[PDB]
Amino acid sequence: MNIFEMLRIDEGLRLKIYKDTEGYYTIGIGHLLTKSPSLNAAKSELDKAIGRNTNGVITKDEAEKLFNQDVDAAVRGILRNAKLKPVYDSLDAVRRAALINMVFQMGETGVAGFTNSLRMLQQKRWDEAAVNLAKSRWYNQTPNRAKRVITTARTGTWDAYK
Ligand SMILES: [Cl-]
Ligand SMILES: [Cl-]
The missing domain is CATH 1.10.530.40 (Lysozyme)
Known part of the structure; x- marks a missing residue:
């Protein structure tokens, strides 16, 4: 087991925009998109994150790519x-x-x-x-x-x- 498998268990994997335990729009493996109540806003933030017009849907690879960045950013934040x-x-x-x-x-x-x-x-x-x-x-x-x-x-x- 390692960090990635651990968080993948905890966060799950969803390929379409969803609301997390707090009601916020998220996608993939717990990638928060926005705290705003606007689906459009969430959609805008997702497309900016991915680099394309996603329409609220991403592929597995894209989700893993965002997860990789997020894990990396978590460590670096601890270290700073x-x-x-x-x-x-x-x-x-x-x-x-x-x-x-x-x-x-x-x-x-x-x-x-x-x-x-x-x-x-x-x-x-x-x-x-x-x-x-x-x-x-x-x-x-x-x-x-x-x-x-x-x-x-x-x-x-x-x-x-x-
Ligand atoms: Cl829980
Ligand atoms: Cl991002």
Whole structure:
């Protein structure tokens, strides 16, 4: 398992414009397009992202291409963030994947705000971190996914994804 397979499980794959768990227009493997309520706006943003007139539909390759960019941007965002980087650098490889997933889902900003969980993770206080991470809107809104990612961070193993 790796980061890509992990997020592909969490986000799924849809070839047509859809609304995510928050009601926002998205496409592919969780590629958010816009927070705006306008389908046209979403359509405009999709065509600009792809490079062609898609009419709200993309191919599998195009979806994977956007996912690749999105995963890359997630890592680079961690690495450029003064609160995130040091956590990330202290972790082992599986736990790092948990942090990338969160960032992909909620943005650098949102994740950089889990101050307390970040410190416990940096200190290797697994169980405490896990408890702290679950005290969040994130977990109350998307609990099945949150649980998988939290167990990943807590155990350093991929069990939640088997
Ligand atoms: Cl883009
Ligand atoms: Cl969920």
